[PDB]
Design a protein around this ligand. Structure first.
Ligand SMILES: Nc1cc(F)ccc1C(=O)O
Ligand SMILES: Nc1cc(F)ccc1C(=O)O
Lengths: 345, 346
């Protein structure tokens, strides 16, 4: 019979949990039954033990079970997520728009900045996108615009107890991996960036168990996106298995960049950077958008077949660049904004 | 400057804290400034990183700075503590309580410190089940020391500011670095002690805290995992005196103790513990008496370390004879009765 003493005792002893123990803990957390101290002890102990893919799957699966779903048959079978976890202008917001403009449906998931968890909501808001929508309007956005956004607090109202604890302790934990694994629209493909290099192998194992087509990505400079500044580690998930690879953007003709050139600031500065890139401005920010958009496209392609790596990337990069240069990406953002403004009437 | 995100991130990254960071955390906890979540995160992260003696000394020192002291000059200079930190999920409060009575009856002043656990993890509960008055203010514990030669500091009484940490420790149950603080925060500050620890790594850490204090202490760990000197096999002892530590392997067979089974050395609930106390102090022979005598003798040795003529082995020979005589001549039994009387008479 599961208890906090028993579960925490096992973690502090540096032991993997028994099956079901992670799930039980998550259910206590999601039901308002776990005290802030119990939530905090578990979050910290799980992090220092080092979670396994099976334990993270239990946490995500229980949390998903408490989430509002999107209506049935409203998510295309081949939707993708584009996101980074924890850890500079929001490349993932721009790449998502570019990917959708290339004809791949995108469903994002997040909160406002520095909260649980993955976000990007502030930037979208700064652009005039209505972020706060229920499942029916997300599904409609997805069908009519090609992109949608799931606002975490709206879709995961039962995570409020954990969210409040994460704020009190303000240190990164296992709970930081949950955003990409609990997207309410359950896309089967994704480009997933992870700051914490070690946990990215674990995240990938969960996507493998799900039979997802995902590139989990780690900038060897510490970024949670694919980088132009140096190389990257990629976990390529498809057909139930992971294989780690080194990724070098110079091998496609990208110039090495400086971290000072991807810098960000308030929501408005970053909205200006989005508008610049979508309007065709060239530079290392664009380079970085195209690259991450290509990865997501390559992930998406992995749903249908196994195409070979370098030609998949060659096509993804071209599709991303063309989504920008035809004006399709700018025009998609404009349709997204128009869609949100039509809801009022 | 310090914050929870900074201290917690350092611990979860498996780094030792910077000097003063443990102290800051502890003071936030003791002033009611820490949220339950922050308290629990820190307790757990400190445990999983593996606390050093410097970190633990900071925690204990801050906690002591908030404790009620006993009145000036009421604690004999040579008072001793006898206590364990607890097992998983067993304990030896039976042995500690009995050894403390026996040591006091041998003529060594004893000042214990503790709390009620609730079932099988106390303690003050055993003493309470013996008719001892556990809940006494500093002035009465002092009188208890003077008139009976023993006393008990009830933790919720002497450490009222620890209440926020105690509530969290309760909420989460799991043993943490906080479980090491009992022996190190006895409000009477005895300079000598026999201190048991279930875990050899943490025992060394505790030895290093006591070494910074110039205590004369034996930190003890049975090599079967008992938080006391065991009779089932060897024990490791960290002998602490004059600011240094002498780690050694101890074998009671060398003093003619028969090997016991782990099945034999209790303890259990308040009541089981009380009956065991009655029997042993009445002269009942067997594994329990042996463990009690062995542990009271170690406390006597640590005491001898204060005014230190005796060498190790003759000190052990003397402690063993004094402990056995305290029981056999009925002095232990009489002292317990006297202690009960003192509590009724106030
Ligand atoms: N309810 C939530 C769900 C999330 F995923 C993140 C944050 C909250 C919140 O209550 O702030
Ligand atoms: N205030 C306390 C001090 C201790 F050492 C142990 C428990 C409490 C409490 O408030 O329950």
């Amino acid at each position: 019979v599961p208890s906090w003493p028993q579960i925490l005792g096992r973690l502090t002893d540096n032991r993997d949990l028994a099956r079901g123990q992670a799930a039980w803990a998550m259910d206590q957390i999601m039901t308002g039954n776990a005290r802030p101290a119990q939530i905090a002890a578990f979050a910290v102990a799980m992090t220092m033990k080092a979670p396994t893919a099976d334990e993270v799957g239990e946490l995500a699966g229980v949390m998903l079970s408490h989430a509002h779903p999107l209506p049935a048959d409203t998510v295309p079978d081949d939707a993708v997520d584009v996101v980074g976890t924890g850890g500079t202008v929001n490349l993932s917001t721009m790449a998502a728009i570019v990917v959708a403009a290339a004809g791949v449906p995108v469903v994002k998931h997040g909160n406002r900045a520095a909260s649980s968890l993955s976000g990007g909501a502030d930037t979208l808001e700064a652009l005039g996108v209505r972020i706060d929508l229920g499942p029916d309007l997300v599904a409609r956005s997805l069908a009519e615009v090609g992109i949608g956004f799931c606002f975490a607090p709206r879709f995961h109202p039962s995570y409020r107890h954990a969210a409040a604890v994460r704020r009190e302790i303000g240190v990164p934990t296992v709970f930081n991996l949950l955003g990409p694994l609990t997207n309410p629209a359950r896309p089967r493909a994704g480009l997933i960036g992870c700051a914490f290099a070690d946990l990215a192998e674990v995240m990938a194992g969960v996507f493998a168990a799900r039979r997802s087509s995902v590139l989990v990505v780690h900038g060897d400079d510490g970024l949670d996106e694919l980088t132009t500044t140096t190389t990257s580690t990629i976990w390529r998930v498809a057909a139930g298995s992971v294989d780690k690879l080194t990724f070098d953007p110079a091998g496609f003709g990208f110039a090495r960049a400086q971290l000072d050139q991807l810098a960000g600031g308030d929501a408005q500065a970053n909205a200006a950077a989005v508008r610049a890139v979508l309007g065709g401005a060239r530079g290392p920010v664009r380079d970085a958008v195209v690259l991450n958009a290509a990865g997501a496209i390559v992930a998406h392609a992995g749903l249908s077949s196994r195409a070979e790596w370098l030609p998949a990337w060659e096509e993804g990069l071209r599709r991303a660049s063309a989504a920008i240069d035809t004006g399709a990406a700018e025009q998609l953002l404009a349709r997204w904004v128009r869609f949100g403004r039509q809801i009022l009437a």
